[PDB]
Structure 1
Amino acid sequence: IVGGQECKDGECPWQALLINEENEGFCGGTILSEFYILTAAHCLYQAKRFKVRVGDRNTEQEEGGEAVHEVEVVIKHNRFTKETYDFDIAVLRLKTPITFRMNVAPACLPERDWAESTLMTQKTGIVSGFGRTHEKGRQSTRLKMLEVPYVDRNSCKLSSSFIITQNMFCAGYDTKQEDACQGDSGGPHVTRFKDTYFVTGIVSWGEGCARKGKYGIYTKVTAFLKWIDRSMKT
Structure 2
Amino acid sequence: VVGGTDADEGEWPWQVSLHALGQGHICGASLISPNWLVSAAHCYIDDRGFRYSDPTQWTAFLGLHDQSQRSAPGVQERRLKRIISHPFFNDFTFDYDIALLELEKPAEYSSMVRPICLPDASHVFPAGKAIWVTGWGHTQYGGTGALILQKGEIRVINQTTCENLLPQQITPRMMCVGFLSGGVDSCQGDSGGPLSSVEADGRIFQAGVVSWGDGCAQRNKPGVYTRLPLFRDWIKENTGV
Normalising by the smaller structure, the TM-score range is: over 0.9
Structure 1 residue 120: Cα displacement: 3.3
User: How big is each residue's C-alpha offset from its partner over 1:149-187, in whole Å with a ceiling of 9 and x where there is no partner?
Assistant: 000111101111451000000000111311000000000
Other-structure match for 1:98: 107
Q: How far, CA to CA, are the matches of 2:115 and 2:127 in structure 1?
A: 23
List per-residue Cα deviations over 1:37-86 (Å, max 9, x = no partner): 00000001263521211111101135311111111111110110011000
> Does structure 1 retain, via aligned residues, the 8 Å contact 2:195–2:208?
yes
- SS at 1:16 equivalent: strand
Q: Work out whether residues 127 and 158 of structure 2, in 8 Å CA contact, stay in contact via their aligned partners in 1.
A: no
1:60 aligned partner, one-letter code: S
Aligned residue number for residue 49 of structure 2:
none
Equivalent residue number for residue 7 of structure 2: 7
Is the Cα contact below 8 Å between 2:127 and 2:155 reproduced in 1? no
Aligned to 1:219: 226
Match status 1:109 vs 2:118: yes
In the other structure, the counterpart of 1:127 is 133
Written as runs of structure 1 = structure 2, the 5 A alignment for 1:13-92 is 13-22=13-22, 24-45=24-45, 47=52, 48=54, 49-61=57-69, 62-92=71-101
Cα offset, 1:147, TM superposition: 1.1
Name the structure 2 match of 1:196.
203
> Which runs of structure 1 show a deviation greater than 4 angstroms over 4 or more consecutive aligned residues?
none
Q: Is the 8 A contact 2:182 2:220 kept in 1?
A: no
2:144 alignment counterpart: 138
**SS of corresponding position for 1:158:** helix
2:127–2:157: 8 Å Cα contact kept in structure 1?
no
Letter of the structure 2 residue corresponding to residue 135 of structure 1: Y
Amino acid at match of 2:134: S
1:17-55 Cα distance to aligned partner (Å, 9 max, x none): 110112511000000011000000000126352121111
Tell me the C-alpha RMSD between the 2 structures.
Answer: 1.5
CA-to-partner distance for each residue in 1:77-108, whole Å, 9 max, x for gaps? 01100110000010011110000112211000
Please give the alpha-carbon distance, in whole angstroms, between the structure 2 residues aligned to 1:99 and 1:122: 35
Gaps of 5+ in 1: none
CA distance in 1, matches of 2:168, 2:209: 18
Counting aligned pairs with the same residue, the percent is: 32
* Pick aligned residue for 1:166 from 172, 179, 189: 172
Residue identity in the other structure for 1:29? A
Per-residue CA distance 1:181-218 (angstroms, 9 max, x = gap): 00000001121112100011000000010011111000
Distance 2:172 2:42 in 1: 17
What TM-score do you get using the length of structure 1 for normalisation?
A: 0.94
Q: Report the more deviating stretch, 132-141 or 120-129.
A: 120-129
Q: How many residues align?
A: 231
Secondary structure, aligned partner of 1:112: coil
